Amino acid sequence: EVETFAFQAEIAQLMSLIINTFYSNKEIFLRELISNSSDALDKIRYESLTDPSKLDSGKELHINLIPNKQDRTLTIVDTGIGMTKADLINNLGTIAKSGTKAFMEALQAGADISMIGQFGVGFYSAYLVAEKVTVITKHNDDEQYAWESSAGGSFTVRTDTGEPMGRGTKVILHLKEDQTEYLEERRIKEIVKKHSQFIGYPITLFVEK
């Protein structure tokens, strides 16, 4: 039912560095996640040019930002290409290996944590603000999956029996208690305007009722 995996050694080391380093410029996590969503959307958009049937699972290409004060969660939803079971368990970790090692070498040489995206491992900056990250994903060629990690060197992958999402990725950030500023509408708008002004897909902020 639920399978548990160890992160690649380099990724586990990067996650501990992120979780334990005193670093006040935490807002970069949102830019990194939106950039990842933009990449997934670019991929499905490109693939649909030669195979329009790839859009049968949904034609709208967008990003939704969903803060939830009551649950203390910030959700980033996109209708990109999504990820396969192989992506979640191995492919993405394999690809991230050289960038993770290079990033850690750069930090040692005095680089700033904000440079994380230049190494293709921006996702892990989510651990600056989140105690747990849950990722629900659906690729055309595979089942709907739930990936999850509270760091500590492991992650889980299971088939997701929850609401179907058609195609794409939903990243659910379970925020740390001192990081609730990222649930504020004005704060999210400020971050998006500063870092993500130039993304080629509509970014919609869902206002809480």
Q: Is residue 107 near a copy of itself by the rule CB under 8 A?
A: no
Kind plus residue range of the DSSP H or E element containing 42: helix 28-48
Considering the complex, state which of residue 102 and residue 186 has its C-beta at the smaller distance from ligand 9EK. 102
Q: How far is the CB of 77 from ligand 9EK (least distance, A)?
A: 9
Q: How far apart are CA 87 and CA 32, in angstroms?
A: 18
> Which does residue 119 touch among a copy of itself, ligand 9EK, none (CB within 5 to 8 A, set by kind)?
a copy of itself
The span of 3-11, 72-80, 99-107, 179-187 binding a copy of itself (CB under 8 A) equals 99-107
CA nearest 25: which of 89, 114, 106? 114
> Which does residue 90 touch among a copy of itself, ligand 9EK, none (CB within 5 to 8 A, set by kind)?
a copy of itself
Query: Using CB under 8 A, which residues numbered 119 to 158 contact a copy of itself?
Result: 119-120
Q: Is residue 94 near a copy of itself by the rule CB under 8 A?
A: yes
Annotated binding-site positions for ATP:
36, 78, 97, 123
Q: Which long-range contacts (CB under 8 A, 24 or more apart) does 197-202 make?
A: 199/34, 199/35, 199/38, 199/63, 200/38, 200/41, 200/42, 201/37, 201/38, 201/41, 201/61, 201/62, 201/63, 201/78, 202/62, 202/63
The span of 4-12, 13-21, 42-50, 182-190 binding a copy of itself (CB under 8 A) equals 42-50
Q: How far apart are CA 146 and CA 164, in angstroms?
A: 12
Q: How far is the CB of 43 from a copy of itself (least distance, A)?
A: 9
